Ligand binder design. Sequence first.
Ligand SMILES: CC(C)(COP(=O)(O)OP(=O)(O)OC[C@H]1O[C@@H](n2cnc3c(N)ncnc32)[C@H](O)[C@@H]1OP(=O)(O)O)[C@@H](O)C(=O)NCCC(=O)NCCS
Ligand SMILES: CC(C)(COP(=O)(O)OP(=O)(O)OC[C@H]1O[C@@H](n2cnc3c(N)ncnc32)[C@H](O)[C@@H]1OP(=O)(O)O)[C@@H](O)C(=O)NCCC(=O)NCCS
Lengths: 417, 417
Amino acid sequence: KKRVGIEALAVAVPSRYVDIEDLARARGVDPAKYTAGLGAREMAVTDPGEDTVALAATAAARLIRQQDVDPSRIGMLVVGTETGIDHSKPVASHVQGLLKLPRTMRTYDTQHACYGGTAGLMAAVEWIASGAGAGKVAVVVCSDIARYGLNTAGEPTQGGGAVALLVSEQPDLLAMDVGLNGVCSMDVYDFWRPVGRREALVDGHYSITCYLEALSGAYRGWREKALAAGLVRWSDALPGEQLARIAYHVPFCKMARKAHTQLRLCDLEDAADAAASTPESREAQAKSAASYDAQVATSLGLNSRIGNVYTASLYLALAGLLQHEAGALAGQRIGLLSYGSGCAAEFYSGTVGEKAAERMAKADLEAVLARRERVSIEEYERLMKLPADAPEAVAPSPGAFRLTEIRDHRRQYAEGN
Amino acid sequence: KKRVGIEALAVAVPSRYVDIEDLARARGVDPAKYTAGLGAREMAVTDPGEDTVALAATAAARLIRQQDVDPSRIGMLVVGTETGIDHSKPVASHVQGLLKLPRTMRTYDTQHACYGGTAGLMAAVEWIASGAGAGKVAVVVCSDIARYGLNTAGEPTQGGGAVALLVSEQPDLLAMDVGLNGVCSMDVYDFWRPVGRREALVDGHYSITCYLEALSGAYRGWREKALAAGLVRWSDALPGEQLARIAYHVPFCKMARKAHTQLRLCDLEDAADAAASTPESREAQAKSAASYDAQVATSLGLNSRIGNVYTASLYLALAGLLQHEAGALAGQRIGLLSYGSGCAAEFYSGTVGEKAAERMAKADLEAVLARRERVSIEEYERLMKLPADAPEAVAPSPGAFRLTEIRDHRRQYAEGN
Ligand SMILES: CC(C)(COP(=O)(O)OP(=O)(O)OC[C@H]1O[C@@H](n2cnc3c(N)ncnc32)[C@H](O)[C@@H]1OP(=O)(O)O)[C@@H](O)C(=O)NCCC(=O)NCCS
Ligand SMILES: CC(C)(COP(=O)(O)OP(=O)(O)OC[C@H]1O[C@@H](n2cnc3c(N)ncnc32)[C@H](O)[C@@H]1OP(=O)(O)O)[C@@H](O)C(=O)NCCC(=O)NCCS
């Protein structure tokens, strides 16, 4: 029948990273807090030339080249970001110009912290599924630079990058179950970043509680619809165990284990026989290492080497999962949990396509990660102290983009040769 | 059959306005430049308590009350704005909390200058038309405060306010022709507002050319699809003349006459017999006072009393049109042209519903406009010089909202009794 969803994806990362244990030592922190406590390995760091536009355009151009997209088939170009660079002019319009895309497309940005990319994805999917986008494709780019500041609690969860999603009626990566999404949103101050403040404000432990609360509501909403649709059942297997994999928004890699335990607790607490269990027995079952290993563990390879990329984090988890398991997963249904502070969560599902492995091979993700260079904490700090209008005098890699200067309040970019 | 579109709308305006001729005199400008040249009458002015959130929440709460919306049926709450107040936390999340709305909805903001509201509207329409939103409604709020600065060319086109749109399968105001939209977008610097800059940057005459260029492409794209669908024909009537009315984005009221002339020129230049005409004869026909009067003139009553409200301007034009003509227009197809700088235009159509007059009566728009107070240019200037975190010590009207203070970087609001 008709299908809609994600056809392909591409990734862009900053040119530099730091080793997370170096950061710990520079901060007088036990490095195992970062490697074991948070699950981090390497943290992307930026200079001002790697702004939201440059990363988004690099990813979207890479998508078009790698997947041989006909640019004139794009009817929607949406950038999900919380790292906007103008109050009015959207990142999507800059990307359109840098890529020299034609005119017959909607362009806009979507904003809700780390949920903005998913919001744009659903707008593109539903544009197609309504019939309005029939025959065309969308490109939805998640682009962000996560900045908490030197000597702050959030600093080891920084990162940056972009994931460009191709959305179409040929959803080779993920044929989405339209209309089955669960959502949970409420007005909170767990994380925010007032206009003009370069660094975020966060109550990190409260943000974890909000994430898990919103996840629970979103997951339960999806589960009710999936049960009614016959996709999962209350059987000897918990409903959530019937998803082949579940990918979660990853502000730090150990959050996926917390999220999966919470999702399983939702099933265990809601089961018709929950009264026969105890909090202790439910928690021990929910924390099942076997379930985490089977459904979640292989989704974190890219995230652990990049850091938090806000809107893109879930989609880097999807990328890492499919990078290695797309063939195995063809024909199987997986789940995805998007969260953004502020806050909103959305849980959705889809079926991996027969051609997913092909599309992932063309994304050539190990090459993307291999182009990077390690720098010192000293150099990371120097770059952090640069104003946003002071890009380093450095060329972009071939086909990639950098901000070069701001002249008369107009942002100027270069494309690498 | 199935229908989707705008069911109802509500409007919020700032509590104060200035007479536009007073502004001219304070600036040493001939007042006829503003009243005849631009078409302005009154300009909304704000104090910092009337921020994007307060205006959006006032409009959305008014919509819910006036239309007796069941808040638990809302599955999407989207705010289109270019007056965002956080890089991360969306206006939509604040509105959700202020209105005490429940949790089962997507929340996010959409951004592309004055096109952001339309982008969100299409996301909501297509969510419903895909089937995902079947049985539910969306609220899409266009909220903005247009600020160019004292003694600037854009100053007489300032304004502020919000329009909240109810979107549903019962689109009593406008049953939209899904999939027929035309769109035209390209990367330009006609107007923009860098992060942290309170006042916009604009090349006003270039922005007019970009508006008219993008309108032409968007209108032609719609027209091709409408011709193929049989909704309009190349007959003795121009295709565009077969729309009962056309509503245009209104940065200033005289822009509607420019836009309508351009739309008609698109028909006259593209007609199979265009070679028999001259630029002079086509322009004289395009500028037809009879066509402007028949299709456009009655859409500007609210805009002329408020000013530019960026994302909301087109929807204030729709509101003013339907305020007086909804019964006459029931069963008739109208056109709508959205533009945002940066830039993007989208042209779409829909049919006004039999119950549109009922829904407009409940919006009680003359009462909304009557609650305002006139102030001096001196007082407008004093309020302009207030920092964004210094609201006046003034209560909100009943059921309306104001920002009261920012405390520990958290925005605080009050609801009027
Ligand atoms: C994530 C964040 C809250 C961590 O903050 P913190 O208060 O410095 O760290 P914690 O004290 O919570 O310690 C983190 C973990 O490391 C563990 N840990 C600490 N030292 C350790 C060590 N030497 N060896 C092993 N583990 C260690 C802690 O026990 C804790 O484990 P837990 O996850 O089981 O609780 C913080 O970096 C932050 O605010 N980040 C930004 C916001 C964010 O990403 N929030 C996520 C919301 S979903
Ligand atoms: C709209 C804007 C460009 C006007 O700027 P301006 O350069 O000061 O004004 P103009 O010189 O163009 O004059 C405006 C009109 O008033 C007319 N006018 C001037 N003085 C007049 C008078 N005394 N009596 C009658 N008409 C008069 C001009 O002839 C002109 O008419 P036209 O529309 O036929 O060209 C400016 O206010 C601006 O930049 N606004 C913000 C951006 C904007 O809204 N742009 C719209 C893009 S769609």
